[PDB]
């Protein structure tokens, strides 16, 4: 199938409580494989998946160094951003970063990503061309001009087309028994009367990986998007995910409702009814 490698970095200032915390987490698809936290007793790049543990001591030593350097760069960025927005030294602010690569079934680059948000708002992003930037506002235009002057897009393009795709291919090979295995959902429909007139039908999906799933209710073959309560997909804590979808139905009309499930792990899509 298609795969992604992504690092999710958070830097958060805390005036009066030391320097900004930096945390970086790496994922292959929906599987975390590394973490760095500047607040850890002895900050190290640490393994968070079994197939990474084999990498060897230089993997750990140099990744630890790249993360410690990234801690300092994100603190520099937070100082600059406070200035660009004319903000006081009193407030806490957040810088987030997403970067990495997507590959197709043959391991070929599909697209690269390098984007940033400040206080939860999009700030700047590398365009799909990997050559040019999109800046959200006149503050991000300063970063854009600086990065154009320093030819940063060229460095990012070389990382995303070379190192990123090469490491993702090696992780997929080393973790093939888990990262290349789709676990289908286990499904059931529950029924709870709410009154004499109405009942809740709830369509369950449990134990699936990866997290991407489609769960719908239909009434007489018509999608019920507006009348369905769909909970966010949630982690079980054992690598797999859960989700449910519920509709309130008139008593006696339960068999007009079908729950439809699509997921990569299923040999074919499921149609479920109550009982």
């Amino acid at each position: 199938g298609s795969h992604s490698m992504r690092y999710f970095d958070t830097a958060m200032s805390r005036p009066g409580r030391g320097e900004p915390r930096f945390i970086s987490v790496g994922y292959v698809d929906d599987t975390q494989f590394v973490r760095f936290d500047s607040d850890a007793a002895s900050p190290r790049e640490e393994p968070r998946a079994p197939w990474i543990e084999q990498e060897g001591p230089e993997y750990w030593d140099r990744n630890t160094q790249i993360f410690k350097t990234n801690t300092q760069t994100d603190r520099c960025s937070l100082r600059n951003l406070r200035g660009y927005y004319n903000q006081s030294e009193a407030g806490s602010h957040t810088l987030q970063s997403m970067y990495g690569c997507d590959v197709g079934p043959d391991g070929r680059l599909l697209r690269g990503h390098n984007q940033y948000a400040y206080d939860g708002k999009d700030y700047i992003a590398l365009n799909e061309d990997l050559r040019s930037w999109t800046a959200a506002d006149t503050a991000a235009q300063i970063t854009q001009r600086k990065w154009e002057a320093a030819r940063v897009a060229e460095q990012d393009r070389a990382y995303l087309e070379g190192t990123c795709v090469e490491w993702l291919r090696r992780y997929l090979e080393n973790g093939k028994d888990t990262l290349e295995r789709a676990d289908p959902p286990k499904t059931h429909v529950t029924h709870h009367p709410i009154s004499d007139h109405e009942a809740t039908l709830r369509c369950w999906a449990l134990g699936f990986y990866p997290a991407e799933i489609t769960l719908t209710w239909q009434r007489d073959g018509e999608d019920q998007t507006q009348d369905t309560e769909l909970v966010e997909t949630r982690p079980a804590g054992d690598r797999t995910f859960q989700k449910w979808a519920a509709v309130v139905v008139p008593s006696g009309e339960e068999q007009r409702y079908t729950c439809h499930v699509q997921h990569e792990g299923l040999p074919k899509p499921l149609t479920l009814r109550w009982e």
Binding site: V34, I66, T163
Partner: peptide, 9 residues
Amino acid sequence: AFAGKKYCL
């Protein structure tokens, strides 16, 4: 050949 270097905004 390791995780990504960042640049200051």
